[PDB]
Structure 1
Amino acid sequence: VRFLDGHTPAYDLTYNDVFVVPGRSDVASRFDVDLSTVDGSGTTIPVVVANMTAVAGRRMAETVARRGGIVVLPQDLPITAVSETVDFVKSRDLVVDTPVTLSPEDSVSDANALLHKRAHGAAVVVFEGRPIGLVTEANCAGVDRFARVRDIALSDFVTAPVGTDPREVFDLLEHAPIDVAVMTAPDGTLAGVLTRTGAIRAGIYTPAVDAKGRLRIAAAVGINGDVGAKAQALAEAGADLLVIDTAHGHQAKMLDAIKAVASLDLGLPLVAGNVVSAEGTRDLIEAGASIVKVGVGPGAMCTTRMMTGVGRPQFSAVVECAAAARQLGGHVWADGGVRHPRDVALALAAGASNVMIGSWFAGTYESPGDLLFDRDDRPYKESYGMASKRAVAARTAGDSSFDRARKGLFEEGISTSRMSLDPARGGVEDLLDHITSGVRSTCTYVGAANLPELHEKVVLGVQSAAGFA
């Protein structure tokens, strides 16, 4: 990377210490920029969903795959659940989104609960595979709490055949009272729904698909036990990417796991981490890892850097890891704390081929967590609220109560960080649009048509802390 003249600090840099200097640009608009990655993950956008239990959901996987990203499944899930998730994801359409389907004679409370599980805002009533109506907001107000769904149905939905160009579907929704377009198969069976914003995103974004034309998905494996057996089982399940993660990637056990998994020669790209050093990245790549995960305690006040003195600023670590990996032909992923598009833009400029988003996507409808309201009816979802129970479901490992208590004595309990739902960006697609707009604006300011060009021509500067007063 290139810095300004004389900008050679005696310290590691964070995302608050750097800025991008505008250069000569010929890019007309944001749409003239290609965001496709070259790391082999197959994503058309540099957004990757972290493998956390409170974020890596099935609906999230479907949505992110359709919008061009990829989601890594948690490593504690059973093989049957992973196989079911992969089969459901790879059976989805590349344009339409799977709507919330309600059978007749169901409870109205169940319908209200299912309404908020997706950003469409309308749940279709289906009988014999045929749509009957859409249940929308305020339909349950004043109605008997024991209503049987087929009492407040609104059979006023716009219908179009599957395969219609979304350009005309957008026009058909110009004067519709509900921004939902239920499209049915030629035999009349339900296939999916569309919306004006969904049609625009379908025309803007490019879905990330495998060689079979199906949505891509990823899965993770732990560092304990027979790693080869789990890797083989996940590869047979249809996973397109394997991620071997841990708190400290630069250890002998992770090297042994990488050697064991790479010996099988499954052909899938391999992701390992996390390291924040050039030596660690080189050691991980030499062991057989194609993608190196970067970022260990990036924050200066995070729990890791308060328990221990171990850590490193994200920007310098990513720069060093990318510089070490590119000469070996590998790629790096930014696995820090991302809460603004500036972080993603700076990570891409540093040389990272992909940026993974963690807890930020937990505050969306598509996240597996259940929606609950605060005292002021603030929509929010409890991060790590039920992940601890799922974590200890596999942590027990059949050990006795004495061993479990001995392990848990030193273990520090992660608190449940409340994350308020953004009313203007409730769906994860809005956050994806925000991040992609930020990255495209960065590319236009720099004057690059694609991410490698952005990394090539980026010019950075250093600023002091006095500007934050």
Structure 2
Amino acid sequence: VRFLDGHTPAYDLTYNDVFVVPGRSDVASRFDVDLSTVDGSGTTIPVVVANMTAVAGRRMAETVARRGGIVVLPQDLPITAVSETVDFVKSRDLVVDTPVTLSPEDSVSDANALLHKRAHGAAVVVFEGRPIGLVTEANCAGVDRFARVRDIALSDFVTAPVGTDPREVFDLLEHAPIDVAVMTAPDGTLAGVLTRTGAIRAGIYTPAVDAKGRLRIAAAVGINGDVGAKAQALAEAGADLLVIDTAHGHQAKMLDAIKAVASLDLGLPLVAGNVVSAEGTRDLIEAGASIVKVGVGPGAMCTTRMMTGVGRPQFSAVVECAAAARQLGGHVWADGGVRHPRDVALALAAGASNVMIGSWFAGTYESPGDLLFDRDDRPYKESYGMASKRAVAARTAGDSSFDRARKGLFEEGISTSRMSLDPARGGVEDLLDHITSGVRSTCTYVGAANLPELHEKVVLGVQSAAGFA
């Protein structure tokens, strides 16, 4: 990277210590920017969803893959569930989205409960596969709670055949009382749903698909047990990418696991982490890892940094690791708690081929968690970090309660967090457009048409903390 003259700080830098200096630009608008990645992951946007049980679900996988991103499933999920989710996701359409199907005999409470797990704002009543009507919020609200769907269902809705142009769909929905555009198969049965905003996004984003034209998906594995067997089983289950993640990625056990997985030669790229040092990056790459995650205790007040004085500011660590990987011909991923689009922009500018997003996406409809209401009725969802205590207890296999409690004594608390959900941008795409708009604005400011040029022609500067007063 390039810094302004005289800017040679005597400390590692974080995202608050740096800024991008505008340069000569030839890009007209944001839409003239290509966000495709070159790390081999096949993502059309530099966004990866973290393998967190409260985040990495199936609806996230569908939506993110439809919008060009990728999702990594949690490592603790059973192989059968993994295969089921992979089959479900690869069976989804690239243009229309799977809506919520409700029986006419279902209750109002269950109706709204299944309604609030999608961002469409409506649910389709299905009888033998044919839509009869739509149920929305404020339609099941304010009514007697013992009523059923048939007593509140609205039979009037817009209908279109498969293959209809999204522009035509939006034009039809220009005056529609309800923005929903339920999609019907040529036989007549339900074949997905579409939305005017979704129709617009269909012309902006490009879904990430494999050689078969099906949405890509990634899975995570540990370093305990037969790593090779689990990796091969996941690959046979349909997984496209393999992730090996742990708190400390420079330990020899990570090297052994990477060598074991690389020996099988599954023919898929490997993501390994986490390390924050160039030496660790070199060791991981030489061990057989094509992608290296970066970021350990990135915050100055994070749980890891408070518990132990171990960590590193995200920016400098990412810069060094990316430099090492490019020297060795690899790629790096930027983990470490992304909270603003500025974080993504700086990660891209530092040399990271992709960015990893965790708890931020927890407060969304598509998240596996259920939506709850707080003291002030404001929606929120609980978060449990990397995994819950019950989850880690399940990974400890069949062990004596004495040994289990002995191991859990040193273990910290669940540290559950109440991630509020923004009403204006509650949808997952309502965050993806936000982040991508930030990144595209950055690219226009720099004057780069794609991410490699963004890394090539970026000039950075440093500011003190007195500007934060």
TM-score scaled to structure 2, two decimals? 0.99
Q: Is the 8 A contact 2:389 2:414 kept in 1?
A: no
- Measured in 1, the distance between the counterparts of 2:357 and 2:390 equals 21
Deviations 1:274-306 (A, max 9, x none): 000000000000000000000000000100000
- Measured in 2, the distance between the counterparts of 1:389 and 1:57 equals 18
Q: CA deviation at 1:376?
A: 1.2
Q: CA deviation at 1:139?
A: 1.7
1:277–1:439 distance in 2 versus 1, CA, 3 Å:
same
- Measured in 2, the distance between the counterparts of 1:414 and 1:454 equals 39
Q: Is the 8 A contact 2:359 2:385 kept in 1?
A: no
Deviations 1:64-111 (A, max 9, x none): 000000000000000000000000000000000100011221222111
- Measured in 2, the distance between the counterparts of 1:262 and 1:387 equals 26
- Measured in 2, the distance between the counterparts of 1:402 and 1:393 equals 13
Q: Is the 8 A contact 2:393 2:404 kept in 1?
A: no
1:346–1:313 distance in 2 versus 1, CA, 3 Å:
same
Match of 1:118 in 2: 118
- Measured in 2, the distance between the counterparts of 1:22 and 1:161 equals 47
| Matched position secondary structure for 1:191 | coil
List alignment gaps of at least 5 residues for structure 1.
none
Q: How does 1:282-297 map to 2 (within 5 A)?
A: 282-297=282-297
Deviations 1:229-248 (A, max 9, x none): 10011000000000000000
- Range 164-173 or range 135-144, more displaced: 135-144
1:341–1:288 distance in 2 versus 1, CA, 3 Å:
same
Match of 1:313 in 2: 313
Q: Is the 8 A contact 2:12 2:316 kept in 1?
A: yes
Deviations 1:185-240 (A, max 9, x none): 11001011111100010010000000000011110011111000100110000000
- Measured in 2, the distance between the counterparts of 1:30 and 1:201 equals 14
| Matched position secondary structure for 2:191 | strand
- Range 305-314 or range 133-142, more displaced: 133-142
- Measured in 1, the distance between the counterparts of 2:189 and 2:390 equals 37
1:385–1:449 distance in 2 versus 1, CA, 3 Å:
closer
Deviations 1:130-167 (A, max 9, x none): 00000001122343322231111101110010111100
Q: Is the 8 A contact 2:52 2:385 kept in 1?
A: no
| Matched position secondary structure for 1:135 | strand
Match of 1:393 in 2: 393
1:386–1:446 distance in 2 versus 1, CA, 3 Å:
closer
- Measured in 2, the distance between the counterparts of 1:21 and 1:12 equals 20
Deviations 1:407-465 (A, max 9, x none): 01111113111111101110010000000000000000000000000000000001111
Q: CA deviation at 1:384?
A: 1.3
Match of 1:451 in 2: 451
TM-score scaled to structure 1, two decimals? 0.99
- Measured in 1, the distance between the counterparts of 2:327 and 2:293 equals 16
Q: CA deviation at 1:393?
A: 4.6
- Measured in 1, the distance between the counterparts of 2:141 and 2:318 equals 52
Q: CA deviation at 1:386?
A: 11
- Range 354-363 or range 386-395, more displaced: 386-395
Moved over 6 A (4+): none
- Measured in 2, the distance between the counterparts of 1:111 and 1:385 equals 30
| Matched position secondary structure for 1:168 | helix
- Measured in 2, the distance between the counterparts of 1:395 and 1:214 equals 31
1:370–1:104 distance in 2 versus 1, CA, 3 Å:
same
| Matched position secondary structure for 1:181 | coil
| Matched position secondary structure for 2:224 | coil
1:374–1:448 distance in 2 versus 1, CA, 3 Å:
same
- Measured in 2, the distance between the counterparts of 1:346 and 1:8 equals 18
Across the two proteins, how many residue pairs are aligned to each other? Answer: 469
Aligned-residue CA RMSD (Å): 1.1
Match of 1:255 in 2: 255
| Matched position secondary structure for 1:386 | coil
Q: How does 1:213-252 map to 2 (within 5 A)?
A: 213-252=213-252
Q: CA deviation at 1:389?
A: 4.9
List alignment gaps of at least 5 residues for structure 2.
none
| Matched position secondary structure for 1:72 | strand
Q: CA deviation at 1:390?
A: 4.5
1:96–1:396 distance in 2 versus 1, CA, 3 Å:
same
Deviations 1:110-135 (A, max 9, x none): 11101110000000001111000000
| Matched position secondary structure for 2:203 | helix
- Measured in 2, the distance between the counterparts of 1:54 and 1:415 equals 13
Deviations 1:52-71 (A, max 9, x none): 00000100110000000000
- Measured in 2, the distance between the counterparts of 1:375 and 1:297 equals 32
- Measured in 1, the distance between the counterparts of 2:151 and 2:465 equals 62
Deviations 1:238-276 (A, max 9, x none): 000000000000000000000000000000000000000
Deviations 1:12-42 (A, max 9, x none): 0000000000000000000000000000000
Match of 1:374 in 2: 374
| Matched position secondary structure for 2:192 | strand
1:73–1:329 distance in 2 versus 1, CA, 3 Å:
same
1:152–1:111 distance in 2 versus 1, CA, 3 Å:
same
- Measured in 2, the distance between the counterparts of 1:286 and 1:9 equals 31
